[PDB]
Structure 1
Amino acid sequence: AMAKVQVNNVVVLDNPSPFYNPFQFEITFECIEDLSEDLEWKIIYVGSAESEEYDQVLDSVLVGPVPAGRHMFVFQADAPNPGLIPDADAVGVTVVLITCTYRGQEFIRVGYYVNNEYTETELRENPPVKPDFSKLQRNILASNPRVTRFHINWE
């Protein structure tokens, strides 16, 4: 009846930072009952709100072993490939997702809004025709974690 894993916290490290900086998350979870399989964690960058086609899976890791207990790991993943991001979605708000999957089933989804912005007043007001990602600051809106759990089969 009870979910064998619950995620307790996520801390967003090294934020704000350049767009090119790796995403770095401290993730804390409790296992109330020994797992026989690995936990699969993903960081997914939403390249474009309009379409899921533009998702970038920044990394996918298998975490284990998972005996009952309180666990933490730091999940780091390289920044997205700007060559796949639509110019119009580059500057402004998007989302990054952290996801966990057990035996092929996603049981949790943590979302953060991400504001990508120039910091130079010249650029902010007169932004480049094509985005300059070397000059964009990524600000993950860490004070507002959005958390969604899903009922899965833990057997």
Structure 2
Amino acid sequence: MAKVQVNNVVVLDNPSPFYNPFQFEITFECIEDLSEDLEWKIIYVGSAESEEYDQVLDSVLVGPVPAGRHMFVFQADAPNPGLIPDADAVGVTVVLITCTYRGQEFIRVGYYVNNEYTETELRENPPVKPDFSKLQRNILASNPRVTRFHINW
């Protein structure tokens, strides 16, 4: 009896300087009007191996909202390098936009993320301590990865 649909995501300002805040142009649809109920979260799963090392970058409480179609941008600051581990800094990582409806997550939106040095000389011989300033976030828009799980509206 599924109430809300995400229709599209659009990755914005990509690629960019590692520090810029993420931007996603989310597009969703909903059949009945709505009570103060949705819940969008951007996660930085920047540690391929362990979930004790991922930050939620921002929380947004969508609702109340009329029936029909809604598009909106989701601004959110960039993952805090401090809580990001060394060897784990210059490669692919993961972004998530999730959305929740009354306690329930019902749609996970994955994005593999490639953090590289943009500069010509450094990418050859990456320094021991990661210099995020010099880094560069190529989000792989081309190939989003989407999980949509049944809940009970």
Tell me the TM-score normalized by structure 1: 0.96
Q: Partner of 2:132 in structure 1?
A: 133
* Structure number having the greater strand percentage: 1
Q: Which runs of 4+ in 1 moved over 3 A?
A: none
Identify the residue that residue 44 of structure 2 maps to in structure 1: 45
| More divergent stretch after superposition (61-70 vs 50-59) | 61-70
Indicate conservation of the 8 Å contact 1:37/1:102, yes or no.
Answer: no
Alignment of 1:3-152 (within 5 A): 3-152=2-151
Residues matched between the structures, number: 153
Structure 2 gap segments, 5+ residues each: none
Q: Describe the SS at the equivalent of 2:88.
A: helix
Give the secondary-structure state (helix, strand or coil) at the position aligned to 2:106: strand
Instruction: Decide whether the 8 Å contact of 2:16 with 2:137 is kept in 1.
Output: yes
Identity of aligned residues (%): 100
Residue-by-residue CA offset, 1:54-108 (whole Å, 9 max, x unaligned):
1110001001222211001100100010001111110010110000001111000
Matched residues in 2 for 1:153 and 1:92: separation?
A: 37
Q: CA RMSD in A?
A: 0.9
Structure 1: runs of 5+ lacking an equivalent: none
Distance apart, 1:39 and its partner CA: 0.6
Q: Secondary structure at the match of 2:98?
A: strand
Structure 2: distance between partners of 1:66 and 1:99: 18
The whole-number CA distance in structure 1 between the counterparts of 2:65 and 2:145 is: 25
Preserved CA contact (<8 Å) 2:35 2:63: no
